mmCIF file of C-alpha atoms and ligand atoms in Angstrom:
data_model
loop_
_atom_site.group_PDB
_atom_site.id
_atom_site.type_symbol
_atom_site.label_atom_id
_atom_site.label_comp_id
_atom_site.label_asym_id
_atom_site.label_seq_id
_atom_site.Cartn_x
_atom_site.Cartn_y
_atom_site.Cartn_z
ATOM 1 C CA UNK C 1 78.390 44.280 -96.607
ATOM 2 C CA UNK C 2 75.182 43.341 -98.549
ATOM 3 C CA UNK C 3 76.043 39.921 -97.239
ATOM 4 C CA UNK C 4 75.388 40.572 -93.714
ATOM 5 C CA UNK C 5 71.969 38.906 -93.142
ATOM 6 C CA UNK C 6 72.965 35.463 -94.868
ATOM 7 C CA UNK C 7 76.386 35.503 -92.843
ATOM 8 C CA UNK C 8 74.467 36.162 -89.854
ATOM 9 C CA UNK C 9 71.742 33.159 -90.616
ATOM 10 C CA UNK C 10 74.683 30.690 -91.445
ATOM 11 C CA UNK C 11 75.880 31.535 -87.862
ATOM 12 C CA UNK C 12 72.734 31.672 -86.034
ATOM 13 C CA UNK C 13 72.006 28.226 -87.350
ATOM 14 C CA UNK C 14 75.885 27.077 -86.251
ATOM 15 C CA UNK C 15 76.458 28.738 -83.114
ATOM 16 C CA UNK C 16 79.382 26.152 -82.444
ATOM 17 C CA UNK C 17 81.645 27.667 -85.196
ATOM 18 C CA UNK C 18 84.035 30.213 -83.723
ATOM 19 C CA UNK C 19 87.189 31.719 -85.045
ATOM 20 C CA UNK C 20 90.269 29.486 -84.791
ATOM 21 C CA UNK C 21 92.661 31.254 -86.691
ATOM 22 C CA UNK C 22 92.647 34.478 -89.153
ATOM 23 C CA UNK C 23 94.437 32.701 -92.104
ATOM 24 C CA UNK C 24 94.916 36.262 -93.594
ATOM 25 C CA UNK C 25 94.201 40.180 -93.832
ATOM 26 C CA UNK C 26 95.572 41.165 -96.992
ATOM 27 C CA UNK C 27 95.396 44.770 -98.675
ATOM 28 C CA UNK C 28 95.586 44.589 -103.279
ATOM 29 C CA UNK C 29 94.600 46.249 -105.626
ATOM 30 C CA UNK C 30 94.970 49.515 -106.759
ATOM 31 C CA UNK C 31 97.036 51.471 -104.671
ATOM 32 C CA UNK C 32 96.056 55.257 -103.116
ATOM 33 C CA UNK C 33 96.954 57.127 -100.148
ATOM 34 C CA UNK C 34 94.859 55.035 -98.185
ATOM 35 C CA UNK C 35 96.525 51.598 -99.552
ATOM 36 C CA UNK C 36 95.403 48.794 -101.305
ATOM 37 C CA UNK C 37 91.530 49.361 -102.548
ATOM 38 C CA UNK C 38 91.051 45.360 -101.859
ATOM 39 C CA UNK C 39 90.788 43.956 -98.803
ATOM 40 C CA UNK C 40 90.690 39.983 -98.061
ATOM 41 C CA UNK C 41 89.808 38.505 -94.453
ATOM 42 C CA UNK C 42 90.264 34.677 -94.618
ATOM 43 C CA UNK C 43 88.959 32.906 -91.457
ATOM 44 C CA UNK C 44 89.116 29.838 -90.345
ATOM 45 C CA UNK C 45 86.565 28.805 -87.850
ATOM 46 C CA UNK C 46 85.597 24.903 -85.620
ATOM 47 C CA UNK C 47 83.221 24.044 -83.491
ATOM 48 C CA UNK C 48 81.133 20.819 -82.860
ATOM 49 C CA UNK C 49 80.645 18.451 -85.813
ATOM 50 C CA UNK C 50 82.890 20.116 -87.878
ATOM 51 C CA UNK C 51 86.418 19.660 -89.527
ATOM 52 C CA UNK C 52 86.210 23.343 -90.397
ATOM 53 C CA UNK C 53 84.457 25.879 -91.737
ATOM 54 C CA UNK C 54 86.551 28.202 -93.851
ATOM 55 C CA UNK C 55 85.369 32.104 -94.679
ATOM 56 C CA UNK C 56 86.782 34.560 -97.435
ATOM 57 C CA UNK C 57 85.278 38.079 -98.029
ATOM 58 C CA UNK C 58 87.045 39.902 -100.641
ATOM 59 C CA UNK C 59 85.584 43.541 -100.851
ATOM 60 C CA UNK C 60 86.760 46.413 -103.659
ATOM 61 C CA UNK C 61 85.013 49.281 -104.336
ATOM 62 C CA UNK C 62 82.424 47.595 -107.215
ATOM 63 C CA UNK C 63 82.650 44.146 -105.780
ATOM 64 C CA UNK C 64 81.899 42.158 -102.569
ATOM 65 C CA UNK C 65 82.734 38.448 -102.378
ATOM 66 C CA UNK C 66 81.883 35.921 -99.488
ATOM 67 C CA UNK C 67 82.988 32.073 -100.220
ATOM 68 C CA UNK C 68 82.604 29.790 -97.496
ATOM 69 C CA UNK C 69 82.382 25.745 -96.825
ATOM 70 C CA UNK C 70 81.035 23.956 -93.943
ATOM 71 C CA UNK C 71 83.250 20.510 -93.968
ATOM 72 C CA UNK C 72 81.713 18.564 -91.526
ATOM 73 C CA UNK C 73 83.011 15.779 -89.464
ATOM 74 C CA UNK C 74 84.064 12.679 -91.243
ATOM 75 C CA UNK C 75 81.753 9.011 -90.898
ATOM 76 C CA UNK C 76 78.165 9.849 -91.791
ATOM 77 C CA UNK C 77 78.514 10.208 -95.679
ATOM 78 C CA UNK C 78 77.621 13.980 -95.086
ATOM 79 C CA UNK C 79 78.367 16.501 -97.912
ATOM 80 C CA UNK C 80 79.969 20.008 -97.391
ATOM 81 C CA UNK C 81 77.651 23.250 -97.613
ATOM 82 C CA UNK C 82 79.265 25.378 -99.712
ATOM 83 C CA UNK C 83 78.368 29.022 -101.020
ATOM 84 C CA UNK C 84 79.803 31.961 -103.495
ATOM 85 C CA UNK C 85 77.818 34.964 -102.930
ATOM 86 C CA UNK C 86 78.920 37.057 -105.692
ATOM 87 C CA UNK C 87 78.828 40.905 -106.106
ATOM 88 C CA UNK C 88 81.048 42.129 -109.674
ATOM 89 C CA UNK C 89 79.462 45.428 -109.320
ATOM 90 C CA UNK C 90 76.777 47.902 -109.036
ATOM 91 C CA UNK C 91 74.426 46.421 -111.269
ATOM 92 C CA UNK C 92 75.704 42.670 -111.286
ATOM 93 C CA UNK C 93 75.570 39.792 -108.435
ATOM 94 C CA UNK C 94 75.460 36.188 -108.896
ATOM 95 C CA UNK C 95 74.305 33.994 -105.293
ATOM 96 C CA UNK C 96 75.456 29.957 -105.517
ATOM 97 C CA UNK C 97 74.802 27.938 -102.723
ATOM 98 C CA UNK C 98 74.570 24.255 -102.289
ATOM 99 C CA UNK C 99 75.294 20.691 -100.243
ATOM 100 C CA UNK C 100 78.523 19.994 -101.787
ATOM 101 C CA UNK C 101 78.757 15.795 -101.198
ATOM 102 C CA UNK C 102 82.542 14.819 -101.207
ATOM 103 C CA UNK C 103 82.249 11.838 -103.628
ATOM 104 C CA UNK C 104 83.115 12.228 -107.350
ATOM 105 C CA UNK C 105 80.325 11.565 -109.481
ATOM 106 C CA UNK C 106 77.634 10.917 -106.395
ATOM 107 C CA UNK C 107 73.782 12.597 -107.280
ATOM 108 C CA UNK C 108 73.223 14.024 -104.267
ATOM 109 C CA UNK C 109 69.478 15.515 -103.551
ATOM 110 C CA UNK C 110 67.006 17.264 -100.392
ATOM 111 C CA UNK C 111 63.628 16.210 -101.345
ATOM 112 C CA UNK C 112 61.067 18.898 -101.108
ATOM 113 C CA UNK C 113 63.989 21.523 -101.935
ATOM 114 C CA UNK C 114 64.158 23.536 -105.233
ATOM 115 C CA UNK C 115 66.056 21.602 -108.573
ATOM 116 C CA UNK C 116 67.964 23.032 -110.960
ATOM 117 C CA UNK C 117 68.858 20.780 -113.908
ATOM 118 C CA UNK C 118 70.457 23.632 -115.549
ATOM 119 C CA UNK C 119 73.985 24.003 -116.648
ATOM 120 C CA UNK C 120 76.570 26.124 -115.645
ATOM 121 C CA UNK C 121 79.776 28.510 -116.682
ATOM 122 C CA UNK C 122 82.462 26.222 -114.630
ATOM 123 C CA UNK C 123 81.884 23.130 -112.538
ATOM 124 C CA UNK C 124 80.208 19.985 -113.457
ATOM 125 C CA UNK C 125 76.401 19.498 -112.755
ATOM 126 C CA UNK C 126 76.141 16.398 -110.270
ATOM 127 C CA UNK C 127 79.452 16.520 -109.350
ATOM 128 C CA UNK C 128 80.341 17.519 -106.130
ATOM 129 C CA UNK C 129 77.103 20.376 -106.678
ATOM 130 C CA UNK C 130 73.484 18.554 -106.186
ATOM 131 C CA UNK C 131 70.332 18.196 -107.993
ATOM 132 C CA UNK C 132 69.580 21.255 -105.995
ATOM 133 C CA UNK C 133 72.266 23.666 -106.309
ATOM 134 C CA UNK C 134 71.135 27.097 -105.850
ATOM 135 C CA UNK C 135 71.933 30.070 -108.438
ATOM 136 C CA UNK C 136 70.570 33.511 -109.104
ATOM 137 C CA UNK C 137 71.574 36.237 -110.833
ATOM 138 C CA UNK C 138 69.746 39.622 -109.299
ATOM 139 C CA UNK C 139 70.975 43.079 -108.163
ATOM 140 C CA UNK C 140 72.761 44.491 -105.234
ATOM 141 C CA UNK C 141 69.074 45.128 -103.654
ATOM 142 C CA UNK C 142 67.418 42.142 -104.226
ATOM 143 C CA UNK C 143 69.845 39.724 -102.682
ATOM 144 C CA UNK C 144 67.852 39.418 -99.312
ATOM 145 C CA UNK C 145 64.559 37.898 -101.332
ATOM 146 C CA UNK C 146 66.018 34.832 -101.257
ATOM 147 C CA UNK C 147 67.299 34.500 -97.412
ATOM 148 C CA UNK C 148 64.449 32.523 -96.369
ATOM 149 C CA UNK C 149 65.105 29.823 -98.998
ATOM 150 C CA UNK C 150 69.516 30.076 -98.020
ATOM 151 C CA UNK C 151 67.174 29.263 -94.258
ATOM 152 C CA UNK C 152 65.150 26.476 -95.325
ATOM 153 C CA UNK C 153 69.089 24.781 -96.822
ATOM 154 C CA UNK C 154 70.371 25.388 -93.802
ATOM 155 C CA UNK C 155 67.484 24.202 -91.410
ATOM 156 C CA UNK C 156 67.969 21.088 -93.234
ATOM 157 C CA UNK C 157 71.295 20.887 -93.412
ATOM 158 C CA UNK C 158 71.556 21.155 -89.058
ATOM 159 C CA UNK C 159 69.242 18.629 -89.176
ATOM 160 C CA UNK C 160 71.446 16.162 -91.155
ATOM 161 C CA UNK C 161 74.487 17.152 -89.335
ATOM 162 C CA UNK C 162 72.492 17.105 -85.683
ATOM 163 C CA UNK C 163 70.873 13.722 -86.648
ATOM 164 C CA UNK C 164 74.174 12.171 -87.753
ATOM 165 C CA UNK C 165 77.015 13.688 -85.190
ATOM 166 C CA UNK C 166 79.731 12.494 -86.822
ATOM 167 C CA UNK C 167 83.166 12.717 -85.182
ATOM 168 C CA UNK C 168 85.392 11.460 -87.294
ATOM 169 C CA UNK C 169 88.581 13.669 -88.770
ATOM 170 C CA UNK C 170 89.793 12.285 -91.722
ATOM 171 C CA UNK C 171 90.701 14.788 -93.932
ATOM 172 C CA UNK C 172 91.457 12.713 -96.935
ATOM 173 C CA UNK C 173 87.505 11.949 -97.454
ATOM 174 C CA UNK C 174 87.720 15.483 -99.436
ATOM 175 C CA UNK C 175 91.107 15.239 -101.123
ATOM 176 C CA UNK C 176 88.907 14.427 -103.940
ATOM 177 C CA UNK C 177 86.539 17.303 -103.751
ATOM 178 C CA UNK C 178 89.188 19.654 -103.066
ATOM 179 C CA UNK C 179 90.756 19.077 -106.374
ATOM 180 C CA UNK C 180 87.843 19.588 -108.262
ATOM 181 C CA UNK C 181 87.618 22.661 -106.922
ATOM 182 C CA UNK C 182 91.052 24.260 -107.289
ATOM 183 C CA UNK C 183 90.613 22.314 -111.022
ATOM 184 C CA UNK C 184 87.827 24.468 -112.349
ATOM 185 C CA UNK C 185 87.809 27.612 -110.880
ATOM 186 C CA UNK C 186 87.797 31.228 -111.987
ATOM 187 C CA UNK C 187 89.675 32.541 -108.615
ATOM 188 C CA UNK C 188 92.833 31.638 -109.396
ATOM 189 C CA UNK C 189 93.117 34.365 -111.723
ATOM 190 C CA UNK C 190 91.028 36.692 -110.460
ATOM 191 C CA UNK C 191 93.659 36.439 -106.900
ATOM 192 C CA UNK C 192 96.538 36.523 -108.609
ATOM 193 C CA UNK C 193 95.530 39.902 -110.642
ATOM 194 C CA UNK C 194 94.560 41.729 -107.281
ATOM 195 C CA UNK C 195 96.747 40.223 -104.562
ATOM 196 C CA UNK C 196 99.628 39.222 -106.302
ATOM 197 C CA UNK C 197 100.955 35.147 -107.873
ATOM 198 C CA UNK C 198 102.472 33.907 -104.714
ATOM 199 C CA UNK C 199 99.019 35.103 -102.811
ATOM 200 C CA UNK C 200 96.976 33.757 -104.779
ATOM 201 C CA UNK C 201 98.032 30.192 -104.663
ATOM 202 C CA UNK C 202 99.029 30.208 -101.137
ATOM 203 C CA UNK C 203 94.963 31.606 -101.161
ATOM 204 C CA UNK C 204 93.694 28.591 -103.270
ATOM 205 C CA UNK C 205 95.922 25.878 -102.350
ATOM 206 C CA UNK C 206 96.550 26.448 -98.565
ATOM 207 C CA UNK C 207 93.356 28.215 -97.393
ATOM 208 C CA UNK C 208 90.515 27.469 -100.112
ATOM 209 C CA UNK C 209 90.957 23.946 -100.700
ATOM 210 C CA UNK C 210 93.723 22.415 -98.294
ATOM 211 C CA UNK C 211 92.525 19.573 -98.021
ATOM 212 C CA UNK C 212 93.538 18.031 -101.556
HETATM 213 C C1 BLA R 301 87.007 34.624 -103.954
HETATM 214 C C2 BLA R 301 86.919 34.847 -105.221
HETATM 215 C C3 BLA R 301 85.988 34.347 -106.238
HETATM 216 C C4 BLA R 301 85.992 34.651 -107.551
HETATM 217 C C5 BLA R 301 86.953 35.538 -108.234
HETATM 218 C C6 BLA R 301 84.877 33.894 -108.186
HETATM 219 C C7 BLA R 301 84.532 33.968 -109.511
HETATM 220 C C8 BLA R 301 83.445 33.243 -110.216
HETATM 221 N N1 BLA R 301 82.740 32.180 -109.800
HETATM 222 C C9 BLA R 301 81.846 31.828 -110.805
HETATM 223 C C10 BLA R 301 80.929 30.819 -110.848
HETATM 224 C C11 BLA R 301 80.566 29.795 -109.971
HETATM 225 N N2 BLA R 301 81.012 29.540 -108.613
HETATM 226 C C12 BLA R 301 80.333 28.482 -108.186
HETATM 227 C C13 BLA R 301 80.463 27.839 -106.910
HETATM 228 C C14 BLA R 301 81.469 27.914 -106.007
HETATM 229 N N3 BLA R 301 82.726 28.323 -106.283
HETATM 230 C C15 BLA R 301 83.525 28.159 -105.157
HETATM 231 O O1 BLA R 301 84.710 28.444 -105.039
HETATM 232 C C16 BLA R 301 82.680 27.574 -104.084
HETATM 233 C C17 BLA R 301 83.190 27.285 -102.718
HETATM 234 C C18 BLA R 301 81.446 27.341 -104.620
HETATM 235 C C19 BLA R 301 80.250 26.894 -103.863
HETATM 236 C C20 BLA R 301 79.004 26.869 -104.144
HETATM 237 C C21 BLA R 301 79.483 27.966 -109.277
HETATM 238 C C22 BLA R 301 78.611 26.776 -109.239
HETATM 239 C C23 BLA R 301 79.623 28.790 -110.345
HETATM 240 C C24 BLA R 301 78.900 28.654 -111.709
HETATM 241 C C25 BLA R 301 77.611 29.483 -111.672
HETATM 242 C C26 BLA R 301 77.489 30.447 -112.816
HETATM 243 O O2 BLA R 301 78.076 30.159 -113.886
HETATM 244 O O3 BLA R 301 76.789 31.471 -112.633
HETATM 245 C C27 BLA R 301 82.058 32.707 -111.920
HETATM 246 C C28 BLA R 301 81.296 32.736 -113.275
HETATM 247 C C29 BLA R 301 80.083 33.702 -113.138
HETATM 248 C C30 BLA R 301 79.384 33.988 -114.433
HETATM 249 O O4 BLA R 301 80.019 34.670 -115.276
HETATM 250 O O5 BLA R 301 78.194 33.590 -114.551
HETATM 251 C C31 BLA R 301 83.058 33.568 -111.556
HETATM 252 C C32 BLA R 301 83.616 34.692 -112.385
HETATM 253 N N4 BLA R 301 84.228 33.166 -107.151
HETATM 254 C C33 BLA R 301 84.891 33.435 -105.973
HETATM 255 O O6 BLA R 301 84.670 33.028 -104.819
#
């Protein structure tokens, strides 16, 4: 995967978060002698300080998709890391990462951390995304130049969560934040046409954003 080297930072910087539970291996797409040219793996993975953290890497033969959110432990006022690392094809990639903060309309910033003011296709700026949410648009080859800035998010966001140690577990701090997401968001359909209706939701609703 062209994805390897952030995966392996996000895990090098949280050691603590093993695999739990693999929610699902699924096989879509279109169909040849080998099976289903789409594959999903949907982890689910704890450790300390955290409710979850919650993988999916969908991979075709023009695309390669790896969404994943750090919830953290509830009681600090901490916001999620979140990230869509986007390949659509040969020539196309889009990278969003970002601290995700579980209250609605909360302006969450990192100071000394790239802004972004701009606006984008789906979401709302400010709104469970921070003044500096992360997005670039670059090719397949180029994703890697901007590793050491994913690093520098997530050096600060271990030292929040290391600072803080919260260990509280309730789950209903991100109903709200959960809802957004399934609200505005282009998977859905983009599921459902590969894997199939009842997949999809069961994706969205039950893996994705559970928590609503
Ligand atoms: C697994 C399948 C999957 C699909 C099909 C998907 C599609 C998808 N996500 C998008 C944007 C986006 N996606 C995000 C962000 C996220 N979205 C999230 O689910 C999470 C957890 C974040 C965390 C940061 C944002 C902010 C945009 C808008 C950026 C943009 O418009 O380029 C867009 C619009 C891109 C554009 O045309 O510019 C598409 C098509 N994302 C996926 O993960």
């Amino acid at each position: 995967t062209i994805w390897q080297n952030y995966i392996d930072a996000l895990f090098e910087t949280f050691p603590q978060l093993e695999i739990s539970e693999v929610w699902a291996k699924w096989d879509g797409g279109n169909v040849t002698k080998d099976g289903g040219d789409a594959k999903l793996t949907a982890n689910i993975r704890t450790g300390e300080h955290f409710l979850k953290a919650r993988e999916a890497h969908i991979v075709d033969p023009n695309s390669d998709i790896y969404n994943t959110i750090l919830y953290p432990k509830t009681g600090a006022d901490l916001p999620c890391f979140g990230m869509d690392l986007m390949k659509f094809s040969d020539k196309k990639v889009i990278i969003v990462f970002d601290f995700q903060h579980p209250r609605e309309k909360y302006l969450f910033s990192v100071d000394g951390l790239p802004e972004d003011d701009g606006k984008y296709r789906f979401f709302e700026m400010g709104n469970h995304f921070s003044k500096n949410i992360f997005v670039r648009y670059c090719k397949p080859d180029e994703v890697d130049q901007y590793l050491d800035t994913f690093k520098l998010y997530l050096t600060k966001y271990k030292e929040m969560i290391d600072n803080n140690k919260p260990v509280g577990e309730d789950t209903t701090v991100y109903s709200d934040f959960d809802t957004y997401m399934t609200e505005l968001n282009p998977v859905r359909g983009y599921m459902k046409n590969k894997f199939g209706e009842g997949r999809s939701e069961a994706f969205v609703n039950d893996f994705l954003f559970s928590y609503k």
